[PDB]
Design an enzyme around this catalytic site. Sequence first.
Site, PDB file in Angstrom:
ATOM      1  CE1 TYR A   1       0.709  -1.585   4.237  1.00 20.07           C
ATOM      2  CE2 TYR A   1       0.765   0.791   4.513  1.00 20.07           C
ATOM      3  CZ  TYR A   1       1.054  -0.475   4.978  1.00 20.07           C
ATOM      4  OH  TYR A   1       1.692  -0.629   6.188  1.00 20.07           O
TER       5      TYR A   1
ATOM      6  CG  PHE B   1      -0.185   8.878   4.546  1.00 18.40           C
ATOM      7  CD1 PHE B   1      -0.424   7.702   5.238  1.00 18.40           C
ATOM      8  CD2 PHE B   1      -0.935   9.152   3.414  1.00 18.40           C
ATOM      9  CE1 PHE B   1      -1.392   6.815   4.808  1.00 18.40           C
ATOM     10  CE2 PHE B   1      -1.906   8.268   2.980  1.00 18.40           C
ATOM     11  CZ  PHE B   1      -2.134   7.098   3.678  1.00 18.40           C
ATOM     12  CG  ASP B   2       1.780   5.471   6.775  1.00 11.79           C
ATOM     13  OD1 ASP B   2       2.920   5.502   7.284  1.00 11.79           O
ATOM     14  OD2 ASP B   2       0.738   5.729   7.413  1.00 11.79           O
TER      15      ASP B   2
ATOM     16  CB  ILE C   1      -8.875   3.120   8.707  1.00 10.87           C
ATOM     17  CG1 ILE C   1      -8.480   2.761   7.281  1.00 10.87           C
ATOM     18  CG2 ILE C   1      -7.772   3.932   9.361  1.00 10.87           C
ATOM     19  CD1 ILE C   1      -8.940   3.774   6.254  1.00 10.87           C
TER      20      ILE C   1
ATOM     21  CE1 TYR D   1      -4.126   8.318   9.344  1.00 11.19           C
ATOM     22  CE2 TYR D   1      -4.107  10.123   7.774  1.00 11.19           C
ATOM     23  CZ  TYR D   1      -3.674   8.874   8.165  1.00 11.19           C
ATOM     24  OH  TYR D   1      -2.787   8.179   7.376  1.00 11.19           O
TER      25      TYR D   1
ATOM     26  CG  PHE E   1      -4.379   3.963   0.069  1.00  8.92           C
ATOM     27  CD1 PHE E   1      -5.065   2.812  -0.284  1.00  8.92           C
ATOM     28  CD2 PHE E   1      -4.738   4.622   1.235  1.00  8.92           C
ATOM     29  CE1 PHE E   1      -6.088   2.329   0.509  1.00  8.92           C
ATOM     30  CE2 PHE E   1      -5.759   4.143   2.031  1.00  8.92           C
ATOM     31  CZ  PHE E   1      -6.436   2.996   1.669  1.00  8.92           C
TER      32      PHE E   1
END
Length: 224
Positions: free
Chosen positions: A135, A145-146, A172, A198, A216
Amino acid sequence: MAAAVPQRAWTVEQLRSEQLPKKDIIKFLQEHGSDSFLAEHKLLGNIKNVAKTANKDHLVTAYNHLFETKRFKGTESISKVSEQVKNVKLNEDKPKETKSEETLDEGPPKYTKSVLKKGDKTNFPKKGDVVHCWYTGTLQDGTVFDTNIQTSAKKKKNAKPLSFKVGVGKVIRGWDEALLTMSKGEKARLEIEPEWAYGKKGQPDAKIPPNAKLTFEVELVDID
């Protein structure tokens, strides 16, 4: 705007192979990379003309580093119908809108998913069963961010998909609802709203401001 970090669609064993048409690999980098990026390897311009200048490994070498250098295609023209600026009112910061206005009648969840490359279409993740996939997250502006997309193992043993059980409060609520519909060996691109990620506050931990859309792409590798 719509162009998050795209997940690997092809494999090094396939691209370099002699069964996959280079014509595609060239069109993929042109729709996933920026002119400047392509210019480097002379991939931009006309595929038909680039297929003669770009070699097999040339197209693959540019398709591999593209992810490592995170220099995918950026904003250049995007959607634009007009530009207006009200005098003394303060309303909206981004262009917003998208011409078309009809996604559903009942109202879709707090996220958007789109299956790019269909997979098995039979082996779906069950509640309690683990899963291994990659991912790449990027904010609205493309702020990473990731990124779990580790380097390839063919070059060096140092790549292992993230294994996590689905339907077990692992990820999530927005990703669980989207991934839950993913199939074995499939690539998708889903965007979860700040309400199912978030929150309206945001994620200062990763320099994530309040109300930030997170888009993503995931690639299922196995399901145990």
